């Protein structure tokens, strides 16, 4: 909508304070004009029709507990935007500065968040399994990365392709978490999962077996549930990306870590230049090796670490 660009202040789902870009027209709306064609955050008001109402606040202060999920959906959509723009020169999810629309307070006790093809959607959680899902920057960026994947490789959401699709979202979710630089780790959804239980998460990239996910191709899940195990087999590729960055010795294979920024450069290039809708794990390894070759040279340490990390997780 039309109005003046303003800066409000509020508290997100975890109780931290942050500034947010708003637009003033009688009310202050969660409409950020500083990023592409805008970031817009809506109240679904516990209904399921979308997008709901552009979020309106009387005084540009967002400290009510009802406001927190909106503060975070809005602010982390901006962080994710800044990551892809500043780090990879990609303008919004479609590379053309598409508006990022998010709705919060979707449904009641809904234990999930998703990119729906047009917008982000956040449940509040039931307060036991989850608190409002926008509170997790890695969740926000994981879901927005599905949009990136859709506009690039178009990985099919089933079997190994689908597990690469999930891993790509976990990888870039994590890298946005590190980019934001507040409380980053290699776990997924730690900030919003199970508020009664400290130290857990939905999955771990550094040790997938901690939550029962495979960390080696010989352990891949071959059943039909979860679209052929897409949130399960992602552990194989997560662990490989973790090793490329941090290094380590995994099933007796030594990997020299090359750090997060080079992990990102390599996987982004693989995603945008080499993956196709039906890429499998072996083709991902080839894509990552070619990407590292493009960027660092075929005799580089970077290319050797990519090979080591894939060998370590049994993907030839
Ligand atoms: Ca207010
Ligand atoms: Ca974290
Ligand atoms: Ca995390
Ligand atoms: Ca927890
Ligand atoms: Cl917070
Ligand atoms: Cl998902
Ligand atoms: Cl190879
Ligand atoms: Na699990
Ligand atoms: Zn996902
Ligand atoms: Zn290990």
Give the CATH number, domain containing residue 229: 1.10.390.10
Q: Which residues lie near ion ligand 10 (Cβ < 5 Å)?
A: 250
1 in a structural domain: no
Q: What does the block give as tokens for 125?
A: 């959680």
Annotated binding residue 110 = no
Peptide bond into 51 cis (omega under 30): yes
- Number of domains, the chain: 2
- The Cα 183–Cα 178 span in angstroms is 8
Q: Ligand 6 centroid to 167 CA: how many Å? A: 10
Active-site pick, 88, 231, 250, 302: 231
Q: How far is the CA of 304 from the centre of ligand 7 (A)?
A: 9
Handedness of CA 169, 175, 181, 186 (dihedral sign): positive
Chain centroid to CA 42: how far?
20
Give the CA distances from residue 56 to residues 78, 142, 146, 225, in Å, rounded to whole numbers and listed in that order: 18, 27, 28, 41
Answer with the one of 115, 134, 154 that is the final residue of a domain: 154
Q: Could you tell me if 177 and 146 lie in one domain? A: no
Tell me which residue range forms the domain holding 293.
155-315
138 is in an annotated binding site: yes
- Domain boundary (134, 154, 174) is at 154
Q: Does residue 165 share a domain with residue 72?
A: no
Q: Is 193 annotated as a binding residue?
A: yes
Q: Are residues 40 and 175 in the same domain?
A: no
Domain assignment of residue 165, yes or no: yes
Residues ≥6 apart with Cβ < 8 Å to 298: none
Q: What is the DSSP letter of 275?
A: -
Query: How close is the Cα of 191 to the center of ligand 5, in Å?
Result: 10
Span from the CA of 258 to the centroid of ligand 6 (angstroms): 27
How many helical (H) and strand (E) elements, i.e. helices and strands, does the chain have? Answer: 7, 15
CA of 166 to the centre of ligand 6 (A): 7
Q: Is 84 annotated as a binding residue?
A: no
Residue from 74, 105, 143, 160 carrying the catalytic annotation: 143
Does the annotation count 143 as an active-site position?
Answer: yes
Residues 6+ apart with CB under 8 A from 139: 113, 133, 173, 188, 189, 192
Last residue of a domain, one of 101, 134, 154: 154
Cα distance between residue 88 and residue 271, in whole Å? 12
């Amino acid at each position: 909508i039309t109005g003046t660009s303003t800066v409000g202040v509020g508290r997100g789902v975890l109780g931290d304070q942050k500034n947010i870009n708003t637009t003033y027209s009688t009310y202050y709306y969660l409409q950020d004009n500083t990023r592409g064609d805008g970031i817009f955050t809506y109240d679904a008001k516990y209904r399921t029709t979308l997008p709901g109402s552009l979020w309106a606040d009387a005084d540009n202060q967002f400290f009510a507990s009802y406001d927190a999920p909106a503060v975070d959906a809005h602010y982390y959509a901006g962080v994710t935007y800044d990551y892809y723009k500043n780090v990879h020169n990609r303008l919004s999810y479609d590379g053309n500065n598409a508006a990022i629309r998010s709705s919060v307070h979707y449904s009641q006790g809904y234990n999930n968040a998703f990119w729906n093809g047009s917008e982000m959607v956040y449940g509040d959680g039931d307060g036991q399994t989850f608190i409002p899902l926008s509170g997790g920057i890695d969740v926000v960026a994981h879901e927005l990365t599905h949009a990136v994947t859709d506009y690039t490789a178009g990985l099919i959401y089933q079997n190994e392709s689908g597990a690469i699709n999930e891993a790509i979202s976990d990888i870039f979710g994590t890298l946005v978490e590190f980019y934001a630089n507040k409380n980053p780790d290699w776990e997924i959804g730690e900030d919003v999962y199970t508020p009664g239980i400290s130290g857990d998460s939905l999955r771990s990239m550094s040790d997938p077996a901690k939550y029962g996910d495979p960390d080696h191709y010989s352990k891949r899940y071959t059943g039909t549930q979860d679209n052929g195990g897409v949130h399960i087999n992602s552990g194989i590729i997560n662990k490989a990306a973790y090793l490329i960055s941090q290094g380590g010795t995994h099933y007796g294979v030594s990997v020299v870590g090359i750090g997060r920024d080079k992990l990102g450069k390599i996987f982004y290039r693989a995603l945008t230049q080499y993956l196709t809708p039906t890429s499998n794990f072996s083709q991902l390894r080839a894509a990552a090796v070619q990407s590292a070759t493009d960027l660092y040279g075929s005799t580089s340490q970077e290319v050797a670490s990519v090979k080591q990390a894939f060998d370590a997780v049994g993907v030839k």
